[PDB]
């Protein structure tokens, strides 16, 4: 799987372990991420910040 890295400047492939791309963004905006990467399990979603997971190309 080839997802995007933290900054939308380059892309990287999630190696074994992280078969799901994650994206961490603040409620500050509905479309304003702070940082992203690759992970295996999705963390708990809070009111302050929320996280989304997806097993697709350039999902995060």
C-alpha positions as a Markdown table, in Angstrom:
| # | Residue | x | y | z |
|---|---|---|---|---|
| 1 | Unk | 0.0 | 0.0 | 0.0 |
| 2 | Unk | 1.3 | 3.4 | -1.0 |
| 3 | Unk | -0.1 | 6.2 | 1.2 |
| 4 | Unk | 1.0 | 9.7 | 1.8 |
| 5 | Unk | 3.4 | 10.8 | 4.5 |
| 6 | Unk | 3.0 | 13.5 | 7.1 |
| 7 | Unk | 3.5 | 16.3 | 4.7 |
| 8 | Unk | 1.7 | 16.1 | 1.3 |
| 9 | Unk | 5.0 | 16.4 | -0.5 |
| 10 | Unk | 6.1 | 12.8 | -0.7 |
| 11 | Unk | 4.6 | 9.3 | -0.5 |
| 12 | Unk | 5.7 | 6.1 | 1.2 |
| 13 | Unk | 4.6 | 2.5 | 1.4 |
| 14 | Unk | 3.4 | 1.1 | 4.7 |
| 15 | Unk | 5.6 | -1.9 | 5.5 |
| 16 | Unk | 4.4 | -5.0 | 7.4 |
| 17 | Unk | 2.6 | -4.2 | 10.6 |
| 18 | Unk | 0.7 | -1.2 | 9.3 |
| 19 | Unk | -1.8 | -2.5 | 6.8 |
| 20 | Unk | -4.0 | 0.5 | 7.5 |
| 21 | Unk | -3.2 | 4.2 | 7.0 |
| 22 | Unk | -4.1 | 6.6 | 9.7 |
| 23 | Unk | -4.7 | 10.4 | 9.7 |
| 24 | Unk | -4.6 | 12.6 | 12.8 |
| 25 | Unk | -6.3 | 16.0 | 12.6 |
| 26 | Unk | -7.7 | 18.5 | 15.0 |
| 27 | Unk | -11.4 | 19.5 | 15.2 |
| 28 | Unk | -10.0 | 22.9 | 14.4 |
| 29 | Unk | -11.2 | 22.2 | 10.9 |
| 30 | Unk | -13.0 | 19.4 | 9.1 |
| 31 | Unk | -10.3 | 19.4 | 6.5 |
| 32 | Unk | -7.1 | 20.4 | 8.2 |
| 33 | Unk | -4.8 | 17.5 | 9.2 |
| 34 | Unk | -1.8 | 18.0 | 11.5 |
| 35 | Unk | 0.1 | 14.8 | 10.8 |
| 36 | Unk | -0.4 | 11.4 | 9.2 |
| 37 | Unk | 1.3 | 8.1 | 8.8 |
| 38 | Unk | 0.8 | 4.3 | 8.8 |
| 39 | Unk | -0.4 | 2.1 | 11.7 |
| 40 | Unk | -2.0 | -1.2 | 12.4 |
| 41 | Unk | -4.6 | -0.4 | 15.0 |
| 42 | Unk | -6.7 | 2.8 | 15.2 |
| 43 | Unk | -6.5 | 4.8 | 18.4 |
| 44 | Unk | -9.5 | 5.9 | 20.4 |
| 45 | Unk | -11.2 | 8.9 | 19.0 |
| 46 | Unk | -11.7 | 11.9 | 21.3 |
| 47 | Unk | -13.7 | 15.1 | 21.1 |
| 48 | Unk | -10.7 | 17.3 | 21.0 |
| 49 | Unk | -8.9 | 15.3 | 18.2 |
| 50 | Unk | -10.2 | 12.6 | 16.0 |
| 51 | Unk | -8.6 | 9.8 | 14.0 |
| 52 | Unk | -9.6 | 8.0 | 10.8 |
| 53 | Unk | -8.3 | 4.7 | 9.4 |
| 54 | Unk | -8.7 | 3.2 | 6.0 |
| 55 | Unk | -7.1 | 0.3 | 4.1 |
| 56 | Unk | -6.9 | 2.0 | 0.7 |
| 57 | Unk | -4.3 | 3.7 | -1.5 |
| 58 | Unk | -3.7 | 7.3 | -0.6 |
| 59 | Unk | -6.5 | 7.0 | 1.9 |
| 60 | Unk | -4.9 | 9.1 | 4.6 |
